[PDB]
Enzyme design. Structure first.
Site: not given
Ligand SMILES: Cc1cc2nc3c(=O)[nH]c(=O)nc-3n(C[C@H](O)[C@H](O)[C@H](O)COP(=O)(O)OP(=O)(O)OC[C@H]3O[C@@H](n4cnc5c(N)ncnc54)[C@H](O)[C@@H]3O)c2cc1C
Ligand SMILES: Cc1cc2nc3c(=O)[nH]c(=O)nc-3n(C[C@H](O)[C@H](O)[C@H](O)COP(=O)(O)OP(=O)(O)OC[C@H]3O[C@@H](n4cnc5c(N)ncnc54)[C@H](O)[C@@H]3O)c2cc1C
Ligand SMILES: [Cl-]
Ligand SMILES: [Cl-]
Ligand SMILES: [Cl-]
Ligand SMILES: [Cl-]
Lengths: 384, 364, 384, 363
Positions: A133, A241, A367
């Site tokens: 994120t 997108e 979200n």
């Molecule tokens: C279908 C899919 C395809 C993807 N394809 C790619 C791709 O091709 N290339 C790529 O680089 N990435 C890709 N992604 C990665 C996606 O960008 C990341 O999973 C996303 O940025 C979230 O990062 P993270 O998984 O480290 O979750 P984290 O940043 O650790 O967040 C975990 C959870 O914390 C909560 N959270 C986070 N920030 C906040 C906030 N500010 N306020 C409140 N709650 C919060 C949310 O519930 C979140 O789900 C893909 C993701 C999906 C779901």
């Protein structure tokens, strides 16, 4: 206020529907949809679509595309996912358009024709174990050595890296700059020395990857846009997108309709609780279907607010989960049977999608961040 | 009243927690979930030798006689570790036999206690699948019975020596014991959401012995209670993993656990789990009191099916990308919570069944 | 693990229910319940309860009370509110107990006997226009002047100030100290020169007040506890208040039971949607009823955690609203009829309660603040 | 497609906004909500003079002929100002008559347009209250009818010259015009959640005239759509007020609108309102195309009954203490949204009705 599909779009729709359902037998098509961009038939599908002209359907004609309208692109995106086919979204909707706007003439000549024909596929290398994120905190490093960049780091969830020809890689090119002013997009061939990947098996069945960059060397000319100005690419040109992701809703409407038919035929539809559950998901799918079109029309008129975008995305992806949960309940004992197993209903698609829908609430924008944006940009709240 | 485990159930809880912790490692879960039976036979044997298969069964059988409350304590620990052993199908069937079985059915119980005999229960059918009115048919065959029909996704059927099969006879629905090797019985292996290997059963005039005439409604209520106990474990384990992860995962310079929306999603899981727990133990007390109306079990099961499924959806979302990874533990809580929340019918079917019991109770 | 009420409590409960429902006829009882602590019969009811000994039921015998157990107190609080009768909760459960623990002998002799008999009633003066959830930021000022304090400021939502004899007033006695270390509790008589109140009519029917303090002079001997030591008094000895608020759920159970019988006897109960809604609210009321008892038992054993208290309160008050919404739907067209109008079902109690339940999610602890406490205190999260 | 109001309806919206804004002040609402009729008669007259009573009605009757979408634009503005006038009961009745009434009954419509004739609709009964299967009976009386039965909480009955009463005759459910002074007709004034004064109607063989055989299912669908339009305005005005409040109200040294939990509740309101709106206009477009399966109107009404009630509950909680004060505006939106969400049945009743239409359309 006319909420009706034009007759032109309905003819296009029924023709795309038959085309996509006809590319592969139904059981084979189910498997390719599950496997997504990581699967061993993805590039095959991409090549078929490219050969038949669908990859640049929405691209401007001056770049070899058909120049069709945003509404017609939306129907295409809807029908390909409704058929359960993978589609090279990141290549056709992110990489292509950014190259058209920010690419050199040499960059455009090198990548666009191959993308159009299905011979070139990209994967997006943004996310890192320490920067998801909070992408602007990424640390994959790109150090300038004369006319080359030397890249060291790793990415995670690099979807399609195992079948891609190139990575659209986000790198820290200036460690001292403020976080937003220190990133560059750089194109990395997946056959570059020092590049590798490892599989990540997801609960939904698709395989994604981690990717590693150990001393990878690329020419400076493979930077897209401004060195240290890549955050400006990551945060713009998102409208394609967005409608691509919204188009996934078509498949849940198909499966809702298929469950109704399934339940009519075996008597499950007689139960009051099934009828209530079908009614509630119908009402939520109607709103989703209309909000998705409203966003699409806004994109077509260049009037999409970030509030409406994020509101539509959060509601739609949460509605997919709701419908998946509820329909699984209607399937009864068959609802727990995985694809390829006996007794599966509708080939286990709903069982499998339940294990996939749970990722889209944080893909395409988290979200919780989107709800912050709705409140801030949509209602003028000060930032949390 | 009192809302705490006795010292016997506390000792039992700690013993089961240590065994599941020992066996339900990443390496073992991966191996078992790719095996032929999908059952952890080493863990089964350790539970037997630790006396945990007998803890809920009668003294006569070699058990400890601690009943449904002991089984739920054991099942909650199993859920907390998503450990693949068919505890609830074997031990709910053992409790039904103990309570409603003939003397010869009860002679099976010593082999359950000592780990050499497993059972399962065939309570569900495809389609409408009203578990209180089974479509499978029982036909009297002189003193016994012959069953004809099909049962859906019978759990952990591999290596089960006997099945309790619900069917409808001339006098209404009943519960019948069948031998796994009976003539006329066959099944197709079928993989479920949790990765269990279940069986779709076909019964062609299969010989069977009736349990007592109250067996079926009682067994359904006990199974509802047992499934809510597994789901309580699944929900609690998921929440604990997720809270631990969010204390350490930093984004934007701080732990994700410091964001208010994150804290509020955690707090909603905490609330559903507390609610699930009290309703579960209300269902155990009701069973102890000989409750026959069925309301308390359905309250417990609805909380498991609605609340517990809410929890595992939230703990997937709060994990982000790492939660999708089958080499990371949380996805297995989603799989377990998802499957259990539809077992014997989902949340909506429970509400309809419960509403009818309330309406009927009102007029009498 | 015993979740049953002991027979003794069940007997007590039946006897109390007969008494409280016999105290006033149903229609008069409904009026005084709606009017609450601001009503013109509130003091009349309190005096009846005092004379019959119910006010000090839970008070220790060494202070003139009956010394009954916490479970018996909870049963009493449940049944008095189940009959729709107001009860002087802040006087019996906050002021009384804090005087027992912190009052001087003069304050105990002056206030405790009158509270027991129903001749003395307090209102709480905490909230200010500018200090609501953030109570520690209150600005109502008390400046020392010899053996008096001179009080200048205003409170809002001072429930019952119009019928009370004394205000339990949180005020700022040290403007320089950190906000948590500059507050005192001072008892202000409501006939003091410079004290006044104005009515605030609430959508639910009851009248609350704003209270104003213009040069009010109060002896220093009416400070409770230590000067500047008020914040501790405000934030401790809350368990009695928690069980009194939890006891409010008993009336929602009664009304659910009454709607079931109502629906039974006009045919509404035959409708599947009605049976489903009754079932869901029954499941939610069961969790509420049992979590409320678990909290009461924890208080009786002196082991209630803040997280559990906050989880239980937030769950309970939100369940009251759900049951009120859902029961209103089951009443059909009569669900919109106010009390005292013809056609009202169950005397309009559910229609009126729906307009009152919307206050309890932020009274007795703001629910968002309690969820933060659940996360930090119950799950170890760092504070947001 | 297109999700924008055209020229004409945008103009209509601005004219309705001005008139409701002029009249639905704190002072006027307090006076009207404690009056005997509970109806703002001044506002009613300004609506008539401005052409707003006639905008949805046929040109033959002196109105503009803009139809149901015109009515919904007006009703949304009404809801946004919680202004007390019986727009939907009068104008839904007027539309029923324009569509299914005799020439004689259509002679009533010029009086509705010029503001001298108000109507209401009696579509509900106590108990089961299936609006599609009225218990109230219609008995032939030569070429006319006589009605016997009870109708519950008939809205804004004071000063209504005529009622449309649903009842069951020998050929099934129907819709009948009754004059408010008709013999055998009486009612008891009854105050509702919104502070409207409704009437519980007793009909002792009351003379009545039938509308066309399709009138009742058509009218129920139009009324469901109109109620959805009011509720969209209620929810939208409520969110707007709350947003402005939370930008200003500070606790813990910052605006309440900086708390992430507050921002998410607001965002959920925003999402519900957007869903409500698209589903409302889909119902309007379905009515234009002559759809009769009733699904779209029930989708729209369910969104009003579930999402709309969700919004006004959130906007109540987010205000804290000030929101319970009847001298502050937000409580009125709760009152309106609460009452509208049960009018013609609540959310659960709608889902049951909608699920039966889905099942029957499946076969
Ligand atoms: C279908 C899919 C395809 C993807 N394809 C790619 C791709 O091709 N290339 C790529 O680089 N990435 C890709 N992604 C990665 C996606 O960008 C990341 O999973 C996303 O940025 C979230 O990062 P993270 O998984 O480290 O979750 P984290 O940043 O650790 O967040 C975990 C959870 O914390 C909560 N959270 C986070 N920030 C906040 C906030 N500010 N306020 C409140 N709650 C919060 C949310 O519930 C979140 O789900 C893909 C993701 C999906 C779901
Ligand atoms: C039934 C009842 C009885 C009362 N009795 C008394 C009494 O006897 N004496 C007295 O002095 N007062 C009394 N009050 C007032 C009551 O204490 C306050 O209303 C309460 O402190 C909330 O403060 P506020 O009304 O100023 O709301 P605000 O502080 O303005 O808060 C408004 C809303 O903001 C949100 N919010 C607030 N803080 C946060 C946060 N940290 N994070 C996220 N969201 C947040 C919540 O949605 C909250 O409802 C009573 C109120 C009620 C409803
Ligand atoms: Cl992404
Ligand atoms: Cl079957
Ligand atoms: Cl664990
Ligand atoms: Cl308070």
């Amino acid at each position: 206020m006319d909420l009706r599909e034009p007759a032109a779009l309905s003819e296009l729709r029924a023709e795309l529907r038959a085309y996509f359902n006809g590319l592969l037998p139904a059981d084979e098509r189910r498997r390719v949809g599950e496997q997504g961009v990581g699967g061993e038939r993805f590039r095959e599908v991409v090549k078929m679509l490219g050969s038949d002209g669908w990859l640049g359907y929405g691209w401007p004609k001056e770049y070899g595309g058909q120049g069709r309208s945003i509404s017609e692109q939306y129907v295409l995106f809807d029908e390909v996912q409704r058929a359960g086919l993978p589609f090279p979204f990141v290549t056709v909707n992110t990489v292509g358009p950014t190259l058209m706007k920010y690419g050199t003439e040499e960059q455009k000549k090198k990548y666009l024709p191959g993308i159009l024909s299905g011979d070139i596929v990209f994967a997006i290398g943004y996310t890192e174990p320490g920067a998801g994120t909070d992408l602007a905190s990424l640390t994959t490093r790109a150090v300038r050595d004369g006319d080359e960049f030397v890249i060291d780091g790793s990415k995670i969830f690099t979807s399609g890296a195992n079948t891609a020809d190139y990575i659209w890689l986000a790198c820290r090119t200036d460690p001292e700059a403020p976080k937003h002013k220190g990133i560059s997009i750089i194109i990395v061939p997946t056959d570059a020395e020092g590049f590798s990947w490892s599989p990540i098996q997801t609960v939904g069945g698709m395989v994604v990857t981690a990717t590693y960059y150990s001393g990878v060397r690329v020419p400076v000319s493979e930077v897209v846009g401004e060195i240290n100005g890549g955050w400006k690419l990551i945060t713009t040109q998102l409208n394609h997108e967005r409608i691509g992701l919204a188009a996934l809703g078509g498949r849940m409407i198909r499966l809702w309709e298929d469950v109704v038919a399934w339940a009519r035929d075996n008597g499950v539809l007689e139960q009051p609780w099934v009828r209530r559950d079908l009614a509630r998901t119908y009402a939520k799918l109607e709103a989703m279907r209309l909000l998705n079109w409203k966003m699409t029309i806004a994109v077509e008129n260049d009037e999409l607010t970030g509030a409406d975008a994020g509101a539509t995305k959060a509601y739609g992806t949460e509605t997919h989960i709701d419908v998946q949960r509820t329909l699984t309940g209607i399937l009864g004992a068959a609802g727990r049977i995985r694809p390829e197993s006996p007794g599966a209903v509708l080939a286990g698609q709903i069982e499998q999608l339940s294990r996939q829908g749970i990722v889209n609430t944080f893909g395409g924008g988290v979200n919780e961040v989107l709800r912050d944006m709705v409140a801030t940009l949509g209602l003028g709240m000060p930032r949390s | 009243m009192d809302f705490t485990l006795g010292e016997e159930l506390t000792e039992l809880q700690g013993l089961a927690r240590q065994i599941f912790t020992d066996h339900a490692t990443h390496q073992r879960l991966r191996a078992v979930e790719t095996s032929e039976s999908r059952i952890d036979e080493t863990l089964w044997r350790e539970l037997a030798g630790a006396g945990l298969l007998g803890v809920a069964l009668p003294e006569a059988a070699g058990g400890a006689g601690l009943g449904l409350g002991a089984l739920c304590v054991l099942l909650e620990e199993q859920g907390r570790h998503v450990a693949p052993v068919p505890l609830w199908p074997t031990l709910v069937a053992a409790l039904a036999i103990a309570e409603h079985g003939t003397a010869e059915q009860r002679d099976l119980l010593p082999g359950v206690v000592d780990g050499s005999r497993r059972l399962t229960v065939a309570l569900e059918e495809f389609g409408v699948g009203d578990v209180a009115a089974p479509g499978c048919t029982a036909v009297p065959d002189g003193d016994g019975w012959r069953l004809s029909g099909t049962k859906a996704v019978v759990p952990s059927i591999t290596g089960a020596a006997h099945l309790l099969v619900s069917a409808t006879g001339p006098d209404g629905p009943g519960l019948f014991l069948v031998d796994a090797d009976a003539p006329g019985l066959s099944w197709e292996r079928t993989e479920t959401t949790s990765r269990d290997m279940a069986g779709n059963l076909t019964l062609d005039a299969v010989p069977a012995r009736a349990l007592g005439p109250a067996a079926l409604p009682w067994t359904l209520d006990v199974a509802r209670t047992a499934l809510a106990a597994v789901q309580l474990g699944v929900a609690s384990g998921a929440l604990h993993i997720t809270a631990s992860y969010l204390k350490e995962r930093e984004q934007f310079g701080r732990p994700l656990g410091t964001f208010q929306a994150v804290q509020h999603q955690l707090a909603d899981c905490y609330i559903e789990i507390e609610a699930m727990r009290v309703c579960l133990w209300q269902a155990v007390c009701a069973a102890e009191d000989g409750a026959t109306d069925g309301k308390a079990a359905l309250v417990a099961k609805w909380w498991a099916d609605e609340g517990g499924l809410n929890v595992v959806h939230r703990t997937q979302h709060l994990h982000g990308g790492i939660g999708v990874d089958v080499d990371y533990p949380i996805h297995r809580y989603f799989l377990w919570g998802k499957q259990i929340s539809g077992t014997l019918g989902g949340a909506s079917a429970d509400l309809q069944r419960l509403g009818d019991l309330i309406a009927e109770g009102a007029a009498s």
